[PDB]
Amino acid sequence: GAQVSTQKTGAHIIHYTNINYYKDSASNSLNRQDFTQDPSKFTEPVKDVMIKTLPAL
Amino acid sequence: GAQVSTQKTGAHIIHYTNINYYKDSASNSLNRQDFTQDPSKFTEPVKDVMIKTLPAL
Amino acid sequence: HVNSMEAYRIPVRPQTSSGEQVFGFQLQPGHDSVLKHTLLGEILNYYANWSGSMKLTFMYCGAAMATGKFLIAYSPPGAGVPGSRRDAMLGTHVIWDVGLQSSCVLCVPWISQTNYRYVTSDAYTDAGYITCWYQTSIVTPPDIPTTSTILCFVSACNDFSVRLLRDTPFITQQALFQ
Amino acid sequence: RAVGRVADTVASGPVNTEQIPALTAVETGHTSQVVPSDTMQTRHVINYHTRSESSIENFMGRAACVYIAQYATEKVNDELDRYTNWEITTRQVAQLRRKLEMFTYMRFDLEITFVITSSQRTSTTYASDSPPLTHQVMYVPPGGPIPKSYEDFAWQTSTNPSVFWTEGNAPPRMSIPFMSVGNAYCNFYDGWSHFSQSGVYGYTTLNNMGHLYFRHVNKSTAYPVNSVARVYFKPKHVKAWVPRAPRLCPYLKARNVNFNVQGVTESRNKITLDRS
Amino acid sequence: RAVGRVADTVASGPVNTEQIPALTAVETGHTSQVVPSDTMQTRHVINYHTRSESSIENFMGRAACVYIAQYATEKVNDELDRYTNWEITTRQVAQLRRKLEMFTYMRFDLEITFVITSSQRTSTTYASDSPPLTHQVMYVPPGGPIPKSYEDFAWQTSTNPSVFWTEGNAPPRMSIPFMSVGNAYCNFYDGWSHFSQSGVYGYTTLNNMGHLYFRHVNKSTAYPVNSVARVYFKPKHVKAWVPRAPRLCPYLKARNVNFNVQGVTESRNKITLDRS
Amino acid sequence: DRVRSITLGNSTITTQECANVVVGYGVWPTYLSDHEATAVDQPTQPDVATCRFYTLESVKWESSSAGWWWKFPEALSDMGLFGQNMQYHYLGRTGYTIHVQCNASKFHQGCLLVVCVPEAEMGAATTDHAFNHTKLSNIGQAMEFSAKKSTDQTGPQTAVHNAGMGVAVGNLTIFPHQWINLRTNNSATIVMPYINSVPMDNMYRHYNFTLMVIPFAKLEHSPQASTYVPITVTVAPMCAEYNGLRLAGHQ
Amino acid sequence: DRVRSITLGNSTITTQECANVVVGYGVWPTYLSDHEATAVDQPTQPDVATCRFYTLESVKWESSSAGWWWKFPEALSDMGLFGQNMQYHYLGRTGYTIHVQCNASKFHQGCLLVVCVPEAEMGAATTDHAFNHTKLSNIGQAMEFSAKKSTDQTGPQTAVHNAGMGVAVGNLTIFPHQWINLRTNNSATIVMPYINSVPMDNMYRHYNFTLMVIPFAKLEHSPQASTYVPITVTVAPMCAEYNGLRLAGHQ
Amino acid sequence: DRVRSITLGNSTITTQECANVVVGYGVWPTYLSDHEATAVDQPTQPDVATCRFYTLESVKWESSSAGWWWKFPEALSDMGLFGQNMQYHYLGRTGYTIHVQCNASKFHQGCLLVVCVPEAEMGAATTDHAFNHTKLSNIGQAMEFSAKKSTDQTGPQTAVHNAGMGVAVGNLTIFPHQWINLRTNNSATIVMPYINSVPMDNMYRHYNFTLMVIPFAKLEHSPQASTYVPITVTVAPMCAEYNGLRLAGHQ
Ligand SMILES: CCCCCCCCCCCCC/C=C/[C@H](O)[C@H](N)CO
Numbered sequence A, B: 001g002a003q004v005s006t007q008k009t010g011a012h013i014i015h016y017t018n019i020n021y022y023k024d025s026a027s028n029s030l031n032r033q034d035f036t037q038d039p040s041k042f043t044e045p046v047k048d049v050m051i052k053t054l055p056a057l
Numbered sequence C: 001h002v003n004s005m006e007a008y009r010i011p012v013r014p015q016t017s018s019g020e021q022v023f024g025f026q027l028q029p030g031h032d033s034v035l036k037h038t039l040l041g042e043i044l045n046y047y048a049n050w051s052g053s054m055k056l057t058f059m060y061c062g063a064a065m066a067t068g069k070f071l072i073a074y075s076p077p078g079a080g081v082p083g084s085r086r087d088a089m090l091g092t093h094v095i096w097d098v099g100l101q102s103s104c105v106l107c108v109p110w111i112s113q114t115n116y117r118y119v120t121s122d123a124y125t126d127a128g129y130i131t132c133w134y135q136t137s138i139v140t141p142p143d144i145p146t147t148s149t150i151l152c153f154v155s156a157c158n159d160f161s162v163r164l165l166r167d168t169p170f171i172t173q174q175a176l177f178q
Numbered sequence D, E: 001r002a003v004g005r006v007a008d009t010v011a012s013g014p015v016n017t018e019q020i021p022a023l024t025a026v027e028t029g030h031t032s033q034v035v036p037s038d039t040m041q042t043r044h045v046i047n048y049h050t051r052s053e054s055s056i057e058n059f060m061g062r063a064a065c066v067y068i069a070q071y072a073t074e075k076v077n078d079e080l081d082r083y084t085n086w087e088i089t090t091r092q093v094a095q096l097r098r099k100l101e102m103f104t105y106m107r108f109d110l111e112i113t114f115v116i117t118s119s120q121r122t123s124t125t126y127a128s129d130s131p132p133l134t135h136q137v138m139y140v141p142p143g144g145p146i147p148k149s150y151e152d153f154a155w156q157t158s159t160n161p162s163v164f165w166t167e168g169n170a171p172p173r174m175s176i177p178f179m180s181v182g183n184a185y186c187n188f189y190d191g192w193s194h195f196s197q198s199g200v201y202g203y204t205t206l207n208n209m210g211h212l213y214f215r216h217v218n219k220s221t222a223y224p225v226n227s228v229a230r231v232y233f234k235p236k237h238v239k240a241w242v243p244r245a246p247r248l249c250p251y252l253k254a255r256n257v258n259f260n261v262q263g264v265t266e267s268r269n270k271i272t273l274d275r276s
Numbered sequence F, G, H: 001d002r003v004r005s006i007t008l009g010n011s012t013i014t015t016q017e018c019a020n021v022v023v024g025y026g027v028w029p030t031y032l033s034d035h036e037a038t039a040v041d042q043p044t045q046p047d048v049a050t051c052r053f054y055t056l057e058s059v060k061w062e063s064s065s066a067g068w069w070w071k072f073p074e075a076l077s078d079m080g081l082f083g084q085n086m087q088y089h090y091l092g093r094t095g096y097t098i099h100v101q102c103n104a105s106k107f108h109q110g111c112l113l114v115v116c117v118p119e120a121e122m123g124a125a126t127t128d129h130a131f132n133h134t135k136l137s138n139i140g141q142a143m144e145f146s147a148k149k150s151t152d153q154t155g156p157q158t159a160v161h162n163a164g165m166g167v168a169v170g171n172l173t174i175f176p177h178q179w180i181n182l183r184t185n186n187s188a189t190i191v192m193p194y195i196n197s198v199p200m201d202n203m204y205r206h207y208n209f210t211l212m213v214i215p216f217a218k219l220e221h222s223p224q225a226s227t228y229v230p231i232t233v234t235v236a237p238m239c240a241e242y243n244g245l246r247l248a249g250h251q
């Protein structure tokens, strides 16, 4: 039940092991490595699509 | 995710195990066993090659 | 003007001669007083490093019968502040023609020698200046008020990133709130 | 390209087109998606930057002090009593409160860590020899029997969760799951507690998290000792919804959002810049 | 042959050749690659020696004390205040400074370890009984709100990284990644901070690493106690570029490379040797 | 394009200078799912007798107008059978189609922000004092901001640049919003979904969202033009459903 | 359509009422070919530090304005690194994107011819007399025509109906031109190629083309409208290259 | 061999007694890669108008000469269009071909170290005092060392055996260097790449490298030989590119 995952490294021996010790999922560590996002709920929440090159009106 | 590597021994039971515990690569130990080198950037940084046996000029 | 809605209202009017300045501020999106309480500026004060391009949008809120052209310029920080519209036409700039589309976007590019600038400002990571100038004038028909209004909006581009979490120097307390 | 990595900019040349990416309409509610490649000539840059530090788990996942609890081994009054309590809230400190109030509804698990420290009270003498002090931090769920004194039966903690800690060791720490009777923790509640639109206005009616009682389980000391217990909340497994505007004004109370009126930003002397 | 192992010498006999390995030209900037096999008769030696200790990771990877921070449980003045601070730098101690300044640009991760020790201040009496002291070492990134006093709100450390440590245990230790806004840490900067070639000359304008604030989180003691915290930097995952000449002259200041003029080496009485 | 027609029930909205439609957080309103419900009794869904357009009273826009706010669903407490279903039920749930409309001329100038703020919890004008609910919102009356601070002993803090919430008024553009710029824009329509931390709620003790209308660029014109411009708000509920039938409330 | 966006270097022009683009004699500017070159040394081509937009000073348009002229490349002699490359080089070669811009109102009226005349060699006002070069063109100043004849002892003949060239001003519409009619047109953009009888030339002793801006229908409006309308000229070099590097000129 | 010809732009260097070429740290200068850039705007690359040879003023070599230093790119601040591109741009990036030349005779004797030191940060002569920038380097003037220590109140410490950096002068042979031994060597050429911790930089607030020329064996000859020998420095930029076009600097 060991989860070997990728460590946070830079860009131009890179793995860590995790064992879960407790029977509750609230006892687990933080989910540091989850970087998913979609900003279209806030920046472009209009009904008809608005292409950049075309005039807005 | 265990990395078994060669221990530093002399010349004339020689292995160690490493588990990475943390999610950041800056949390890792030192890279003690990296002995690569190339001194030609400093000792012989000339454009044309200079053979030892031949005269330099 | 900060204690009213007059703080957001950049005033423009018909001119006697052209090429005068409308406004100007330093491009310090976490330290300058113009940009540090905006919604982009408040997130950056939780961090110590910022990187990426920004979008300055402008919005002409005058009458539909009034026309106008404007030059909005970004200057890299080497030479100092631009002193005229001739000094500002040498950097990154855009000429905005006020028409049926009321808005224009000046895109401030990331022109830096480091991959990150600092949120609290210093001289090593200075980012430059934003200025706006009258390209032509405001020309109106009769029976129209003189002074109009321009609204400036800030946002981050899709290559924007922040780094090195910190406490913000905006909220304080001397005791526990009871 | 990996998840969380920013976009590259593409090489763009000169244009003379009927396309107008710079001209838009703010009246539509739409934020324009203009890239620097659209308004000027750019080069191809391979951007390797990541949005790691800006995640909701990384922005929130640092422990912040939420309460300072004081209690002694000898009663002065009921503020420096043998025991003390704290209604569990996140609004008494300003640093964590401003970070949580950037969202309307959140849903997280907690880590509570205590930094308990003692100090000898000012006296005419201090020369004693005391065994190490041990503390109890009992959680009381909403509606349970609370300690009405020291030596109480309610400190028997047969069903309440307790922790015991001797001074000198590592700080105590436990994990708390998501505890709301709704589907999210409400940072804001625009309403009342009674149906007639009266009673208590605000988020106070949606915060029934219970109390946290502190004491010394040692019976006595030779000379009185004051203790201070700092409570540290670190949220983990965080979800968040409906991002709020950040707060301008400082806080005044813990149960209200009441403020004093302040200007929108700091001032300057003129609207232009005047050098060469 | 393994990586890092020195070269063997080969067996060479007598020569009478038109080859001249001994004669060269220093004017070319070239260091001659002459082996003892070229200028004399040698035997075959299998050299098993290794260049392990001479690696940049092994030469740098030992912890060195970089600062001695002093603070007390009772203020004398603002130098022996309740709290203290230190702008993070590597130039106040001379042993680590001379090792880092053998290179122009470096890039490393850090390990910071604190050796905190207390001592009872000189008084007319010492006979007391105090609980164990607990310390806080809060890091403040460049531009954050700094503690202006004890009992400050800025010690709530909701977003700043803090550490807490009771006396008696193991020394505290954390890891720091590579933190420069450029692509390497600059040990040297030949330039100014302002574009008009004025302001601050030197490496001081490229060092914005923040402060490190120290205090006792205990409120009081019966008699005042002075603490000393030693800061230990060990660089790991080290890269280095452009090797500098070692420094001859001792240092005078921490923000400059200013020196007093000294001779190139120690002297002797004559240039020859005169015995048999 | 600039034309748009919205039909809900027996009511139609036509607009000849429309900017666009802002849809919430990208979510269209819908009925509650079976895997998200809590109450067990069968809901009632009056589809056309409640999800129709209800117009409110106009407000006079002046040069010295600071702004107005409406709190919902309490703004429609007496609007037909939407108001009769609130009284007879314990729980309710709905999204909205807010339509704000204001025409002036090609010789007027001004700009209005139209935000929909979920849980716009307002502070008190005189602090250390709880305020009355009729100062927060009457039944359909437009509660209005002020240019300077309020010293009301039992009212909200109506200074408009702080927006009643202690925040900067310029940062309200994260909430679902449009602008009515009189140079180009005639109306502004926002479709809000149901935003709450519970699947249904009581529609009297809770203001789910607050509609604010704020002049950022003030109204100015020639004195020989029309000196009266009104601002009308037309709101349609969407996918409204109810639970917990008992006697008529609402105490 | 009426919208157009021109991006050159770090500068952008936006126009919401564009007539069209006039491209020269149907030729786009480009670099010199190998089978047409004469000089043998390698040219220098600063692609974005020189081929960017440089705006000049505005001129006030009045009812009694006769017109203005600019002579090129001498009009951009001090405009950034386009002016620094002229001083250090013997030869140069470039095409241009001329953009003239003037907005008034729907209550103004006027019309401007915008011609680009190659080799607009001007006669003298006082004949049997050679004129000064600073009367032909200063460095960026708009040299302006007159309604009646000129009696300047060392200047050009600036009567506008003869256009300084002894021709009829109405016949200038064979040179690449647009019109700015204030009823319909906001700006006017002309793309000029390199026109010369030699492949490269010296950019100081030769005015390659002259931009004239002439009111054919004069500016008139009500006295209660805006009495000041300016005319701004924004010029971008295109495919500029240079030869013959020596010390800084230009004598 | 001893002959070498270096051609860059419209300039050629010929040498009949060349030692060799020292190339940096084994790296040839080149333009910045796409996976290493930070700025997003298009750079300008004047290939032959900037990457040409620029010669400086000669310095008189005497028997009592301690040495001279030049700081770059500030040594070429006024050298043609390399100096004009520094003023108009925020960032710049270049490698160099340094060529130092000094001939005497077969009857003279001397030896010069020619080092290129990256980030040669100099200490102050009078300590606890910041020095002026014009004492570190003028625009093209050779700043010169001294045989004994300096007591200048606002200048660097110019004692040559400490090399201004607090190090031993004998240990400068790790930096890219040659020697001019008058017995055998006529000139000395060093090709330096771009060395910095950032991909581009400002070329005014930062001296990227310092060229030092130091007599290790002093000049001595018969009194009836030529008593004047000069030392000329000819420097060519290589692959110079720029970013951040704005007005002319440099404050
Ligand atoms: C002695 C053992 C102590 C055990 C401690 C248990 C106490 C924790 C239980 C309640 C947890 C409440 C979490 C608080 C969340 C915030 O109030 C929300 N952000 C606001 O609704």
Ligand SMILES: CCCCCCCCCCCCC/C=C/[C@H](O)[C@H](N)CO
Pocket (backbone or CB within 6 Å): E088, E089, E090, E100, E106, E110, E112, E136, E137, E138, E139, E161, E162, E163, E174, E176, E179, E185, E186, E187, E206, E207, E209, E212
């Ligand atoms: C209480 C928790 C303390 C956490 C400590 C964090 C402090 C470390 C952050 C900054 C690290 C800076 C590393 C310094 C590098 C040198 O200055 C470079 N060699 C010179 O540029």
